[PDB]
Design a protein around this ligand. Structure first.
Ligand code: ADP
Ligand code: ADP
Lengths: 532, 532, 159
């Protein structure tokens, strides 16, 4: 109203395109009118201000040193040392990540892994090395283009989408932006946000992306995007373009202990301001890993170590008497209350029909159990979790296997006409291709129908054939890592997954007991205590 | 005239950062426009006033010892059992982290608890401990970021958000800002104010928190924020980093009586100007708490004892009869009318099919009167109460268990496909969204389909799994507090939680009589009044 | 009422009056008030039957506001029928000549004459504009079995 004349000068002082200037002129002749009593004038001035608020004509340094990135991803993060090779061979070779634009294979370098892993920390580290401003943005709960693109501006209360809004929070026009929680954009509310990402997906088409608040193709030419794929089950098929998948698996107990001892506990002590007045034994950290965090990464362990540090700080505020205290495993419960988990599952006191499996979850590899009961009925079958049909088909295959071998393991002669079965699975959706732990359900059905107990110390995963074969499956290494974190030793694995076994770290191949199998009956006889 | 000179003197006396001072002086130089017309020299005057009365570089003495906070929590507060420690821990952390290491650190004590139980009193005592100012900010009905951030400062009719008002009323820049009821926000009208909370509420972004009525972002790098929500299942996920919860559970009736005698009833006596003129016997106090209030926390006691004080004021003021009155449990209805709630739950004459379990509702822990109609039909379980399939899944698991124990409880030989079931659960989707009261619905179904009275005054809480084992349930404190709210002495708890149970304070222990269980076959032994 | 304005509030509930209380308040203060309001000073007599007729046939709002309006109408028609001549020293209005001074009775005397209907029930509620019935009605069509709320009420009524 009063500064508009100055606003008239403020437009072209900072470099803006000329179509933007044309639409600003179209929205500019509408001035010289009262604002109050006219919300259209208010939203018009909001648009005029936004024409300047959005970033224009800035830059970031072009440093892409191979050795700098190597050191930044090496010394800061004691973990990795293997995926760092992959990101090196990708980026150091990749002069087409940005700066150079061609119509060829330029993948957006998706990051896949459980929430606990430091893929986001990898984003922080690579952004620090590249010296391009970092900003994540949440995408879960977003299913609308109007929630990602601008809100159509016709009345007061219109704002651009969180993409442009986030790019306003930074002071550059060529950033590297992590897209946190990019797993839940479903085309069910006002179009497909996947299409908005698709125009963004290309390194040159995003330069033509037009908002809805603003109506000009915005400049996305030298902007890199990296996406956090927390889910390891399914990917958006339209987003298949320009993919080279980068996956972060689970962590070994050795690696978790080392990372806790070297670059997480020191910073946790630092956040409390201590100079090292608290020390923790290695066995204490082992107990914290085992009996306090049943996760796939170090996210929960960070919180637990913070709890320990805060308890130590409060105890030290009771008086100045500590040159240094070492917190061994003896007094751990005095800082974290009751131990929240078992040291291992050797005290399970084997159940009857219950089995244990390795399921595919958005938190990556995870140990889970499957429960089945033989209730009288008409041989019907019930499931849990509104399951994907992959596990339903696995259950049907298990039933077919157990119908032809009723007399091989003392199963009832007709259990498909007189006894119904209720089956529970903690993870129901299973967008992962095929049943992740179908053989676990097969074992559970066999144990439940056998009217015999079943050992609970042994995890397994894979699929069953209609002929009783133990099918191969991907991600076996992650499930082995998850079982190792819980300490489950005897792991049953398909004979077809020897390739997955070779790449396992030597910290895994020693403390477990692998069991290569190709028939369901073998797995049945290696867990069921009595055969008849 | 002299008004501009006075404003110049005021802006000279008041200090602020250099950019703010320079731009305020420039907009002061931008005066002399039409005062008695459209806002061009008046909104500028309002801007200058806003910049002059919002405080800059004004603070309070801070905490330098946990001993003073120890005393302020011991006296003028009943102690609050396990929450004696957590606040002291956090304050120790804050005291030790005063060497300017709070940025991107120092979480803010989200205080989850029912409105009745002392939360704002905790904040008031804490503020008194450090000698800080106090000011609440109600955010239970906020839907606009402009109610938090400002608004475009170009016209008259738009004021800054609640935060700027609260900073203005407080004479210093680092008060104890208590954000009321933050969880119950919504995003229905324009925008989403969740990002406003994210920016204001995190250090290293509070100084980055932007204002809109004042174009200059204001710095909250010193405010000891504290936030009291009621539900952890509704706060936005981004508002969980640096958000450590200090949970405040309900109260036992013994604690209610002990605090009524000390802080509540004497406050009412001082309120109605009846100092040392009327007494109340502890029998009357326990009658009041057990018959007139059925809420977690002691806010109801405030109203009830205020009513008693007012009635005493009227009865005295129509003529004194002695110097110190008295009252017992036999004449409470003379002062509060009909006792709304039964003094004891042993006189409930157990009903036919309905069971009653425990739940931690956000308003306060209470009992779900889970009702079951075993209407004859074709066999189906329709579950009302605005609930997801998690309640339906717990229902199906319990139904499976009873199907495994048909003849063990007089149940029909087949009832999954013979009698339809209606299961009304009054909003079981409360915090801990999902089945945390599966055994309650299990015994409800057992009573309903066995035509045997589900014993009342035994309020249970637990989980039923497909096999039948009663697995542990999180939060074995809120459940017991809700158990003792309704004056229930008999409680059924999973055995796997007894290790947690031993950690509970003696106030919740002695007043309750726990009969630990590990199966459903033993739960149906307690609450079935007859043997069959 | 706003929650910020609900603290430090003590509620003093004043629901509507009762029919005999309505007669009593009309006889004690309302009727003399309106009689001196119009300009009449004691030459009109009104029987209690006429008062009850006014109350139960021309007012359904809780209280006396509608009664105030109806009694003002009575006073103004009395201004008619005394202004053109003092025919009588104290004119008496019974239940018979109440529509000569007012409109047609717009409400029934008693609800007992409702002649019970096949498929309707008479509810109760306190709508914050005044108490009222909830004449909830339902229907039974031969179909396949399904419930349909109608009236834009909450799902609790469907429950
Ligand atoms: N592979 C890894 N190597 C080193 N550190 C890791 C690794 N994975 C996780 N971390 C640690 O986990 C912590 C949390 O990182 P991050 O997940 O990026 O933060 P946020 O949880 O806020 O996204 C970091 O401090 C990082 O040191
Ligand atoms: N130990 C205590 N526990 C609960 N309430 C208390 C305690 N001590 C005092 N009170 C009183 O209970 C009232 C309710 O406190 P609180 O719940 O914090 O505020 P609000 O009810 O406004 O949320 C306070 O006014 C306080 O005077």
């Amino acid at each position: 109203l009063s500064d508009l004349e100055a606003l008239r000068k403020k437009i072209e002082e900072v470099g803006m395109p000329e179509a933007v200037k044309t639409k600003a002129l179209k929205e500019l002749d509408r001035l010289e009118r009262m604002q109050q009593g006219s919300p259209e004038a208010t939203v018009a001035r909001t648009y005029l201000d936004w024409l300047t608020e959005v970033p224009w004509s800035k830059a970031d340094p072009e440093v892409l040193d191979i050795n700098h990135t190597r050191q930044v991803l090496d010394e800061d993060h004691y973990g990795l040392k293997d995926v760092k090779e992959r990101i090196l061979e990708y980026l150091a070779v990749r002069q087409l990540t940005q700066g150079l634009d061609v119509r060829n294979k330029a993948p957006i370098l998706v990051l896949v892994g459980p929430p606990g892993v430091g893929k986001t920390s990898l984003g922080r580290s690579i952004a620090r090395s590249m010296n391009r401003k970092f900003h994540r943005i949440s995408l879960g709960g977003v299913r609308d283009e109007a929630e990602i693109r601008g809100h159509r501006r016709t009345y007061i209360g219109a704002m651009p989408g969180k993409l442009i809004h986030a790019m306003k929070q930074v002071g550059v026009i060529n950033p590297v932006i992590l897209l946190d929680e990019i797993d839940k954009m479903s085309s069910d509310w006002r179009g497909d946000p996947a299409s908005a990402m698709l125009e963004v997906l290309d390194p040159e088409q995003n330069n033509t992306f037009t908002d809805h608040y603003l109506d000009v193709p915005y400049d996305l030419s030298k902007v890199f995007f990296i996406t956090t794929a927390n889910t390891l089950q399914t990917i958006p098929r339209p987003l298949l373009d320009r993919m080279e998948v980068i996956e972060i698996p689970g962590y070994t107990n050795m690696e978790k202990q080392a990372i806790a001892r070297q670059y997480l506990w020191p910073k946790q002590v630092r956040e409390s301001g201590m100079e090292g007045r608290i020390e923790v034994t290695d066995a204490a950290i082992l107990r914290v890993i085992s009996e306090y965090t049943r996760e796939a990464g170090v996210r929960g362990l960070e919180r637990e170590l913070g709890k320990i540090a805060r308890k130590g700080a409060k105890f030290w505020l009771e008086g100045a008497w500590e040159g240094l205290r070492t917190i061994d495993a003896s007094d751990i419960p005095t800082y974290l209350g009751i131990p929240r988990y078992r040291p291992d599952k050797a005290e399970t006191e084997p159940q009857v029909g219950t089995a244990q499996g390795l399921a595919w979850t958005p938190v990556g590899g995870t140990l889970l159990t499957i429960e089945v009961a033989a209730v009288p009925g008409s041989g019907k079958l019930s499931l849990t979790g509104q399951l994907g049909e992959v596990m339903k088909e696995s259950a049907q295959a298990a039933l077919t296997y157990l119908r032809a071998h009723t007399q091989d393991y003392g199963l009832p002669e007709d259990f498909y006409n007189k006894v119904d079965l209720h089956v529970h699975v903690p993870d129901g959706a299973t967008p992962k291709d095929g049943p992740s732990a179908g053989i676990t359900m097969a074992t559970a059905i066999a144990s439940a129908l056998s009217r015999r107990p079943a050992r609970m110390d042994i995890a397994m995963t894979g699929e069953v054939s209609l002929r009783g074969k133990v099918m191969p499956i991907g991600g076996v290494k992650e499930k082995l890592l998850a079982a190792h974190q819980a300490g489950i030793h005897k792991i049953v694995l398909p004979k077809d997954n020897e390739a997955q076994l070779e790449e396992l770290p030597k910290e895994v191949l020693e403390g477990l007991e692998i069991k290569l199998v190709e028939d369901v009956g073998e797995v049945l006889e290696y867990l069921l205590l009595p055969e008849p």
